[PDB]
Each structure stands twice: as structure tokens, then as C-alpha cells.
């Protein structure tokens, strides 16, 4: 059961090992395009937070979820921000959603007084006003019901089957991590030039011990030139110090 486009459900995902291999192997995909990351390089980075949206839209409008578009599903229902990260996984689902009798359980908003900033929601269904004199009771002339139902049939071609859509959005390397792909820890060493991979932050140097106090809501220190030079060991809670060979 996927949501309607105008009342989409956003889900948290935290404290788990994320493997996208069991996902990208799905042959019947029709689209897998990523903006800030590449689809094949998602198995070595740890994300601060992951949110997985969901809705079902008509096949013609699957191109409209990308940032910077406009229309009746990109300004009145669900609008992505201009600086989007993460990526969208869209695939045809004509077998499940569509029905021969005519599926009538998917709505979308048509009339709104003004647009909406990204990632906003509106369950309100008060009658839209178009004329000078407000109406009441039932809608009609100069005032309309804001929601109209999709009509899905298996007859219609591409552009009218429902493409199920799920969108993953995640901030990259600004906070303590909770979710990322499998890896094998390799102990810890000090005062020996090594190749450290701390939560996806590659580099090279020697890791001494430091006495600078980290506030509880911080993980990475920085210096003038905007380069990380103090990290918190993910397993223990020691504060290290990265300096070049």
C-alpha cells in the first residue's frame, strides 16, 4: 500500500547496515539516477540520516520529480528542493496498482491559492475559492473541490500507468553516522603512517592522541584551510589528531 501523491509518507531509517546490492539488481527498473552520489559508490559511505519518501504518480509525470521542474505535481503536491542530494528509484508497477474495473484510490491536488516550499504537506481539503462571493455546502460555480481522483486502467499506454516512486534523501558527512554499508574493522594504530578510513573519510597520516574537548553534539574538528584534523573514534570515544607524514 503506497501513499497518495499529496499525502506521502516519510520514513526514518537508523542504526542499521545498508546494502544497496539487493536493491540495484532489480532488472525491471526503468530509472535509477543519482545527483550527489553515483549509484555504484553507495557501499562505502556512512550517512548522518536517511529518509525514504514514497508515492504513486502517473507514468507521464515521473520525469517531473527531478529538481527545477514545474507543473501540477511539482508545485501543488510535492516539490523537491533545488539542492537535492540522494536519488530517486522509479519503476513501473502496472501489475499491482492498475485495475480492469478502474482504480480509484489515488488523488492529487489541482487548485491551490499559492505554491509550497519544498517538502511541505497539506491534508486540508477546504473548498477552494475562485469568485468574489464565498460559497458553502457543496462546491460548483466559482468554487471547486480541491482533489480529483486518478483513473487507472490497464488499457492506457506508457504515460498512464502508475510508476511507483521511492526517493532517498540523505545528508553527507556533517554529523555522527548511524547507517552505512558492510566493512571489516582493522584495529587501531598510533604514530605509524597508515591509510585510515574513518566513516568514509579517507586520508593518510599518523594518529596521535589529543586533549581538545569535544562538545557532545560534534564529531569532526577543522582548521583554517577547511581540512579535518581531529576525529572521534567510532567504536571507542577517544579524540584523535590527524597530521601528515
Amino acid at each position: 500500500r503506497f501513499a497518495s501523491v499529496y499525502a506521502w509518507n516519510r520514513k526514518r531509517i537508523s542504526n542499521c547496515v545498508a546494502d544497496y546490492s539487493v536493491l540495484y539488481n532489480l532488472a525491471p527498473f526503468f530509472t535509477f539516477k543519482c545527483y550527489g552520489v553515483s549509484p555504484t559508490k553507495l557501499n562505502d559511505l556512512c550517512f548522518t540520516n536517511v529518509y525514504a519518501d514514497s508515492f504513486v504518480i502517473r507514468g507521464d509525470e515521473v520525469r517531473q520529480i527531478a529538481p527545477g521542474q514545474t507543473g501540477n505535481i511539482a508545485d501543488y503536491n510535492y516539490k523537491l528542493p533545488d539542492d537535492f542530494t540522494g536519488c530517486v528509484i522509479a519503476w513501473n508497477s502496472n501489475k499491482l496498482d492498475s485495475k480492469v474495473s478502474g482504480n480509484y484510490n489515488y488523488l492529487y491536488r489541482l487548485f491551490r491559492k499559492s505554491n509550497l516550499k519544498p517538502f511541505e504537506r497539506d491534508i486540508s481539503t477546504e473548498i477552494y475559492q475562485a469568485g468574489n462571493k464565498p460559497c458553502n455546502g457543496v462546491a460548483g460555480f466559482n468554487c471547486y473541490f480541491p482533489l480529483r481522483s486518478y483513473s487507472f486502467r490497464p488499457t492506457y499506454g506508457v504515460g498512464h500507468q502508475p510508476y511507483r516512486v521511492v526517493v532517498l534523501s540523505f545528508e553527507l558527512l556533517h554529523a555522527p553516522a548511524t547507517v552505512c554499508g558492510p566493512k571489516k574493522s582493522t584495529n587501531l594504530v598510533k604514530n605509524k603512517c597508515v591509510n585510515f578510513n574513518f566513516n568514509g573519510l579517507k586520508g593518510t597520516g599518523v594518529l596521535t592522541e589529543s586533549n581538545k574537548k569535544f562538545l557532545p553534539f560534534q564529531q569532526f574538528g577543522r582548521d583554517i584551510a577547511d581540512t579535518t584534523d581531529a576525529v572521534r573514534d567510532p567504536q571507542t570515544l577517544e579524540i584523535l589528531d590527524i597530521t601528515p607524514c
Partner: antibody, heavy 120, light 111 residues
Framework: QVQLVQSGAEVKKPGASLKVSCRAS????????IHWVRQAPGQGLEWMGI???????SYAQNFRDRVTMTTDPSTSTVYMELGSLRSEDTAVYYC??????????????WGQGTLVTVSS | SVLTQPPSASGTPGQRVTIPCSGS????????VYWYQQLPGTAPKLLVY???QRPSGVPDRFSVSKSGTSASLAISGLRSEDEADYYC?????????????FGGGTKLTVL
């Protein structure tokens, strides 16, 4: 034991109307989707469309705008209404059932076949 | 019209005759394919459906296989009743519509 019966049809003028019936017995009528198919002489086969036993129906887009469905889940009958005929639509029609889930499935029942033609 | 089939087929009794059906991603590249055999003055029967199971009441001599994006049906022990027209069916989806397209057909007979 299980078999579908249709209506024998004869010559029809071009632009006329045809009401073809399909009566099924020996199984639960309101459990299987219905496929209607049309075969023209000197050609392959073309399925007319798909029908829910109790509800609406869906049609091939090429053959839309001229075919009408009505259902009656009381005496187990399914009807085609056809209009705006031409001399090039003379063919044979079959009414058949399919698996209860439609699409991918097994089609054991089949239509006895009814002929439509134009001549004078 | 999208489905491509040989215009006709033939073969001596006791031989093995192979019939192809080549489509595309929309027709065969995603879903199952069915094969249908039509006899003169008879309703259509079933030869292979689901591509991994064979119906009841039919001999299993009708060998079937999928070669990538094509279907192949091979027949051995040819007899008089084998003379029939063969079609291949596959639910196809297109940019203008979608349907239950049948194959062009192939007339198989012996002189």
C-alpha cells in the same frame, strides 16, 4: 460439462449494429476474467478486450470507440454491442475465460466462434 | 505486427522442426510468452504456457526454450495431425498503448 455458447450471426450491412451474447456454465461465473478475441481471414488473431464478470471492462486502444460492454451477473451472460461496421471488419469472434487473476495465465475455455460478413 | 515469425514451415515425418518467435524487450524481454496451435476447423489449443510448465492432456514431446529475447519450439515425431498454424503471444507495452499481442503465425504442413 464446461463450455461457452454464443449466438449464430448472419450477414450484416455496413454501419449496422451487432449484439452478440456469451452464456457460460459449469463453473463459478463471477470468478474469472473474460477475453473476447477476433480473427480475420487471411491474417493472424486480435483480442477484442477484457471484461470483469461483475463490473466494467477494458478494450484494445485500436478497436476502442466502437465496442460496448454490458454485464449481467444473474443469468451468467456477457454481451458485445458493435457499431459503425465496414466491409473490412468481417471476421470470427470468440468468447473465452482466463485465470482469475487475468494477464499471465492459462486459457482452457475458448469461444465456439461466430462469423460476421457483408454480402448481397 | 510487432511479433516476427517465419512465413511458413515444413518437414518430413520423423524429423525435428524448430519454429522461432523473435520480439523485443516490450514483448518478450520482461514477461512470459505463450504458444498457440490452430488446426483446420478446430478451436485453438495450448502448447506451452508459463514457459516452465506443461498443461495436462498434451504430449510433452513439444520441446520449448527461451534463447535470450526469442522463443523456440521444437517438435519431433511429426505426424499428420501436426499440420497446424503456430502463434506466439506475449503481453506487450508500448509508448502509445499496451495489449495482448499475438504472433503473425507460421503455416506448418507436409506435401
Amino acid at each position: 460439462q464446461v463450455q461457452l455458447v454464443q449466438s449464430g450471426a448472419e450477414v450484416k450491412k455496413p454501419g449496422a449494429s451487432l449484439k452478440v451474447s456469451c452464456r457460460a456454465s459449469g463453473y463459478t461465473f463471477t470468478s474469472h476474467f473474460i477475453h473476447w478475441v477476433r480473427q480475420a481471414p487471411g491474417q493472424g488473431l486480435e483480442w477484442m478486450g477484457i471484461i470483469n464478470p461483475s463490473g466494467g471492462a477494458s478494450y484494445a486502444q485500436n478497436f476502442r470507440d466502437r465496442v460496448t460492454m454490458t454485464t449481467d451477473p444473474s443469468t451468467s451472460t456477457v454481451y458485445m454491442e458493435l457499431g459503425s461496421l465496414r466491409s473490412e471488419d468481417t471476421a470470427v469472434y470468440y468468447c473465452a475465460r482466463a485465470e482469475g487473476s487475468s494477464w499471465l495465465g492459462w486459457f482452457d475455455p475458448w469461444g465456439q466462434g461466430t462469423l460476421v460478413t457483408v454480402s448481397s | 505486427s510487432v511479433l516476427t515469425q517465419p512465413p511458413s514451415a515444413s518437414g518430413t515425418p520423423g524429423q525435428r522442426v524448430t519454429i522461432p518467435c523473435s520480439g523485443s524487450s516490450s514483448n518478450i524481454g520482461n514477461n512470459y510468452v505463450y504458444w498457440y496451435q490452430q488446426l483446420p476447423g478446430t478451436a485453438p489449443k495450448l502448447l506451452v504456457y508459463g514457459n516452465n510448465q506443461r498443461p495436462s492432456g498434451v504430449p510433452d514431446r513439444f520441446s520449448v526454450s527461451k534463447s535470450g529475447t526469442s522463443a523456440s519450439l521444437a517438435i519431433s515425431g511429426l505426424r499428420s495431425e501436426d499440420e497446424a498454424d503456430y502463434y506466439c503471444a506475449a503481453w506487450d507495452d508500448g509508448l502509445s498503448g499496451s495489449g495482448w499481442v499475438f504472433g503473425g503465425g507460421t503455416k506448418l504442413t507436409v506435401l
